[PDB]
Symmetry: D2
Subunit: 449 residues, 4 copies
Amino acid sequence: DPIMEKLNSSIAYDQRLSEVDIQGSMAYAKALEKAGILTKTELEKILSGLEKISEEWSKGVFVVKQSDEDIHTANERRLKELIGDIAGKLHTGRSRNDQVVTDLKLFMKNSLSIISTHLLQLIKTLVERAAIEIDVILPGYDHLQKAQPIRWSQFLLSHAVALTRDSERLGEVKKRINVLPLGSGALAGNPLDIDREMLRSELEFASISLNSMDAISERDFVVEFLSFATLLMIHLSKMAEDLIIYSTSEFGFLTLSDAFSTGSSLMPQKKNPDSLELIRSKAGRVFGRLASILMVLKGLPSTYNKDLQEDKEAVFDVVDTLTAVLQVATGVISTLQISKENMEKALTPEMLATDLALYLVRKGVPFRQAHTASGKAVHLAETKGITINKLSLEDLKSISPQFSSDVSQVFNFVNSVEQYTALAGTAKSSVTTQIEQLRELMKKQKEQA
Amino acid sequence: TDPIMEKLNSSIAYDQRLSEVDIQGSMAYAKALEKAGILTKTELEKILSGLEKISEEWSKGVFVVKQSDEDIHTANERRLKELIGDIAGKLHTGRSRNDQVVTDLKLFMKNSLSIISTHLLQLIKTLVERAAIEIDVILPGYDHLQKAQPIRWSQFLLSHAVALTRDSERLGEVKKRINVLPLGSGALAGNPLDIDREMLRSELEFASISLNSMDAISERDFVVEFLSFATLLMIHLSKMAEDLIIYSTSEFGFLTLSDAFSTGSSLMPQKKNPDSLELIRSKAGRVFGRLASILMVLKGLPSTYNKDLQEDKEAVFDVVDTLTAVLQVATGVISTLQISKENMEKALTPEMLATDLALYLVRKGVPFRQAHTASGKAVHLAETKGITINKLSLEDLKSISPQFSSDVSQVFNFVNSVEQYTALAGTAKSSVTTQIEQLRELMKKQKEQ
Amino acid sequence: TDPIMEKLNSSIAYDQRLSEVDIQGSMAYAKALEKAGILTKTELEKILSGLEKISEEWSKGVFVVKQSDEDIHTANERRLKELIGDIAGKLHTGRSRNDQVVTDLKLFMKNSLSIISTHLLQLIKTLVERAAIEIDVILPGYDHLQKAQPIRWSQFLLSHAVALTRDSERLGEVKKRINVLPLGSGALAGNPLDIDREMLRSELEFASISLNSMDAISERDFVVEFLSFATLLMIHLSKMAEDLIIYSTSEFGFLTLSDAFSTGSSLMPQKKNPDSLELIRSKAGRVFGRLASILMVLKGLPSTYNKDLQEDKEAVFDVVDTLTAVLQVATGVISTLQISKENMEKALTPEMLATDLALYLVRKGVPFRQAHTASGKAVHLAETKGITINKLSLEDLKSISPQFSSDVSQVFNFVNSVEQYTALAGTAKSSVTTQIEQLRELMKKQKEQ
Amino acid sequence: DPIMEKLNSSIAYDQRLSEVDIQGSMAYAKALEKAGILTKTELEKILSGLEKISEEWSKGVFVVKQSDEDIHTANERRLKELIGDIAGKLHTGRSRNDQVVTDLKLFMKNSLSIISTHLLQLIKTLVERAAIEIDVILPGYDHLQKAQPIRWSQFLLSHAVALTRDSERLGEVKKRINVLPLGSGALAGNPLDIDREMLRSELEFASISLNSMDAISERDFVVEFLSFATLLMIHLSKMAEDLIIYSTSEFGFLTLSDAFSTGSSLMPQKKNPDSLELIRSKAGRVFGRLASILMVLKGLPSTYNKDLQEDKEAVFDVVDTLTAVLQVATGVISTLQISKENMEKALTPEMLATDLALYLVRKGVPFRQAHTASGKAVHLAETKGITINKLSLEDLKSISPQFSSDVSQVFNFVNSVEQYTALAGTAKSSVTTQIEQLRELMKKQKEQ
Ligand SMILES: N/C(=N\CCC[C@H](N)C(=O)O)N[C@H](CC(=O)O)C(=O)O
Ligand SMILES: N/C(=N\CCC[C@H](N)C(=O)O)N[C@H](CC(=O)O)C(=O)O
Ligand SMILES: N/C(=N\CCC[C@H](N)C(=O)O)N[C@H](CC(=O)O)C(=O)O
Ligand SMILES: N/C(=N\CCC[C@H](N)C(=O)O)N[C@H](CC(=O)O)C(=O)O
């Protein structure tokens, strides 16, 4: 049945595993010779023939045949075409089962190294920008309503901190991915007493799988990777939402560069944040991949089943998505233009009523009564038609004798943010400390490779 | 006000579960307020004594929730005021429901993850102990749910333990990021009174403190992470449930669940319905549903706190209770089930040794393809003669290949079959013994960490 | 035998909500048994009288559940035997918990869907009626959250009304399939006593009866469909919520939610937090989680009944109560919010009419591309001259295109702008009026059901 | 930025809408002529160029250029290359916003027509085999444990019934997709009083969209279709699970044809049900698409947002999956071979104890005593080390005087299944009724 054949066939996409597939075969071939299954000459011939395939794929000259069901079959066909019947001894004791997961894990390890580089660069970009714009203040929001003054850098660092947790998760996922599954056979293990330690060393895996059935049937490494990817996209979807809103003419806090926005010649001042919308939408694209693999795996019996073939397309899509999205995010953050003018202009006296209460608290007035007094000043100012920073000292003392002339220091946005010196707060000293901690964090994550 | 709105916005019905951790969070905060001079020594002693009283009321189940209590935080503060008067009002000085709630939830999850760890490790131990005892049992290994080759029952049991061990490793990783103190982050900009966060960390027993107030109050990574860990864990259990359910059918006849974990009718006494395993399998969907819920709640939310975040609690409570129950039922099922060694061995057929026959020749220098062709001839010859392959005469085999010697009779032995897989992770007895040792060493580390 | 197993397997804690429909199902079944000659007429009056007392105990909230009650079915039968004696035992003859439970759930959902319909239709009517009253209001239409062109505020309200109308239509389709009787399917192969299913249908008021016993007992399509309907409805509400939240910011300043549906502090009386809309938006995630869980529970399950199916009830109850609460809060928000006609009008700018300037030329025969270029030239000229395009003189415009006449001044009028959209579905007043009448008709048709 | 350009670009996949995009433009062109935006002669040249572009794609010779952002741009570019400046008047009053949703609905409408055909064929295949193999009896399962004898046909029809509901849902989704969005403009509607009724008739939609903002921003039609597709895959995953189980050597009820299974020459009698496994896995793949679009749409503000671009890849994947999946399922069901002998041999006397109790119930014995009596009978058989059908009448009469020699009829598997004559039951008359009802249903649905 032609519909069955096409549906079962994976060559159209698993071709991307061409190079890692060859590497796993070179490693296995060398182990077969050490095991005496192949002669030294036979090994030379096989390795030389495998190097030719690698090049054919590398130059984009490899010819796929209608007969090729998967990349494994395709490569064995080509080898035989280049070196003859000796190519048939290469698959001795091996199965497509441990071969395919070996391929995928090598591919993922390479891909995770690339993702890490782009992820760390995004974090670095946010942190550097926070260091440069440390004096900029704007409103901090809750329920998307202006609450209090905060440093723009505190906002940037909040995203950087979350992204560092994603980087930490990436490292954890990479560790479990860096475990050799080759030599598990079809399900009960390799029957030729193959040297798995040699395979590990050759393919550069950190250790080898503990159980053959598990090694062959689990896709924990795929789910794990997809969970890491999804949470990372959630973080990006939130940063995107923040920046799209701040870029509105209504907010007017920042403007995206021409490279990351779209516009019209009829309305030259209108810039659409297409880049951020693309990023936000990928949270769903990536989550969908996580959702599908979890459902594919649910309730499946041991050991290998054809259902597992759905892993490949999900992993490739997410790898490419993450790679593209992280670079665009980096570009957006490094090239956007902020309006310090509009950010400061958005700060209002009404946002300092909480600070007025804290002024009383610092003088020994209980929390409740200080709250009540500040509320009274706010109301009194409203009835007089003025702002609280304009209330006369006499006005204030009519509400509380505790209000002294130094209360004028409350009505200053820099003074407001500087109250937050406790670790992690928005005071400049605290932001400075956060930047030092992140720089150290980036170093040890890059270090851990 | 609107009654429907009030009910929808209110969280007291479910967040009461945080009663004790909320009290613990307030005691620590009280101590720090005294060190900061917001509370006097005497005020501190009275506040602590009062919170201690409230902790006991909840413990004995005599705490009285009032219609006016919108949440657990409000109920505790109301009750503390009823108990000690006006000074109770100084407790919330500089604190927010925003940093209070994530502190409460992380303390709750840390204690819950310790309980879950205990049950997960017991399940793993139970599987490993049974694999060590039933180490000689041999049965069919399956792929595409079709009989493939003989394997040790213990290799099957260890395949599940290995996967659950990765689940335990992930649990530790999630616990680490949960063990970070968010208190002292305020509503979003940090604590305004230079509260000593290191003191709060030590009192509450967290490993470190949060780096950025905005991230600390708005992120729910710790919830997502926990849910991803729990979902993959349920996936594993759904696979093990699928295996046992099938193995427990009369058709397979490999094992029978105990009465405690199955249901039956007096009209068909020998019919045992595996209700326990079906409950377990279905919980994968229940847990995955909570993971999907929270990811959608967080996707695209702006900074910082939004009421959308309140959905985290019911998801966490449900999953914690589900895992605690499910893990214990699984341990019970595994330790109390009865296998049929006879039925398992009877399921092993000569036809399953055709691959071993080809390996027999392979180990004699016969090229893979040719040995594969030869085994096929023997299989065919046996067919036309209405006999099993272990019944073909030596002369008959020799007509096929001259490399078939009399020692070929050892191929037709299921113990000899599984003993081929001595390569690390295979189903040979020595490999199984090794795995048991490795898993025990891994559990030792995970438990002492 | 195992306490954890027992608590996990037991459903009485929640399925108890099916108490009344379970009793109605038993009354209909009792009558059918009497027709089959299984019950005497005298026995039937006793049974029916007994069931009525049980109905009242639940209604008055006096029904006492016992530790032995595994589920509502067992609870009700227990009580019946306590009320009338041994004759109570004849009620379950030929019946199974399998066909009994799905009957109960569909009766419950049919009743719940009727209630949800009323709320949904009320939300829709609220939007339509408000659109009619505020038909003269004009504000910016947005794409990529950037001001694009003037639109009627009513066009915005009606866009949400139209989507919700499709939700109402889907609710109707879902209700039709739920309105099919499964009672009389037995455990899996059918009712063994030639029960009169048509009589059962009539008594319980279903529209038709299930076609196949195995399907009727195992399928949970009706649960899935309801959940899909609920999830799309929540998606619509999450979008309306997002819109309203943004419009209510002080930056946009387009509308203010009433006190009943917002929260705030006495320190910032002008700051109104849209809790109501945030609660609604988050419920999209809560509802989607339930759909996700049931789909995962059902995937790959074999026929016929399995304990996995018990996960359906909690998901249905949650979504039913969530939708009932959210629709009413949504109705309250829409009907009580106050718009700022002044701010909506002030947001309309001349820059938003450059496209209309191009359309002015297109209607006089200027080819699209050239008119666009001409309008672009006017935009640049205004910029250089230091004014806005509505200020360019006729001499200015004629220098761009001789097709500009004195009547071009009519282009610079926001009412004239929205009035260009008379084609069906557009924002012109006549189109908005038409939509309102089309929606009033759809609501009438749907309300009639 | 190259990365940004590549990410924003949709040409790689949206070119699949090449034909419907053209049909949309032709219909639009005709409407422009009627409104006086185009002369009859300008219309003739535009339609001639769109026709040629239609052929280039058909013949697979259309050349996509690095500058093409999407299919809409690619066609307009080529149109200008072919007929010059007049090409530019085509987009007058139109937006890529209402243009793209028009193309997707046209495509989905055509796709749903093809899906319906394969779905109805699958249903027919199940129903007709049920009629032919109506006498076959095998065990019925609950908790995957043998419960009671049932007809194989009742099993086949249980799947046919669920699939008929998927068909009904397909028809419902199709109706809402069959609504014209063209003429909605970028968001406020069409500005030149374009004749939408004319566009509707030309494109053959059943009606036109009610609100421009909704028409351009909603993707309900994508969600609905993915919901229909996901529930259909759930049904197929369940059927796959049953068949995979029944094909094990342990059950031995059936064998798949060589075309839909895989094997090895070393173990000739062993067939792997690869087809069914592929089918089962597609439930996750389709569900993944549903999950992704729901997340994409959640919390988006009005009106158009680039986030909406994610709809196309999900729709294409799911359309192609259902098409292939349904046809493979039809093949599997039509070509599999059952073992009447194995199905029959699996029926056990112990599967009739329930029937024994029912026997007393019809004799007027209360359900509880009937059950207890049958229970005492099973235990007495056990002790005696014999099957319940081996008990003597005397032994039965000692448990309950209601047992008469006619109790012999209870121990017969056909009589067992024949008890279920109530509509929808497994008795032959009820199975016959189901076959008839389903044939009429398919008729009504086909006459869609
Ligand atoms: N076909 C096969 N493995 C397929 C793995 C590769 C597949 N494209 C995938 O992605 O899972 N192997 C076993 C037998 C074996 O190769 O040992 C079988 O199912 O027959
Ligand atoms: N109400 C409030 N936070 C609610 C947190 C607890 C809530 N039940 C949840 O679960 O998120 N806090 C701020 C103000 C504050 O308490 O600092 C607000 O929204 O106004
Ligand atoms: N237990 C049972 N049905 C459970 C249905 C109710 C359950 N709480 C649910 O919600 O699924 N019935 C069958 C047999 C029968 O009652 O006919 C069984 O599993 O033994
Ligand atoms: N670019 C655009 N629509 C893109 C729709 C097609 C897109 N490939 C998709 O799939 O959503 N149109 C508007 C303006 C317009 O075409 O009227 C814009 O955002 O600039």
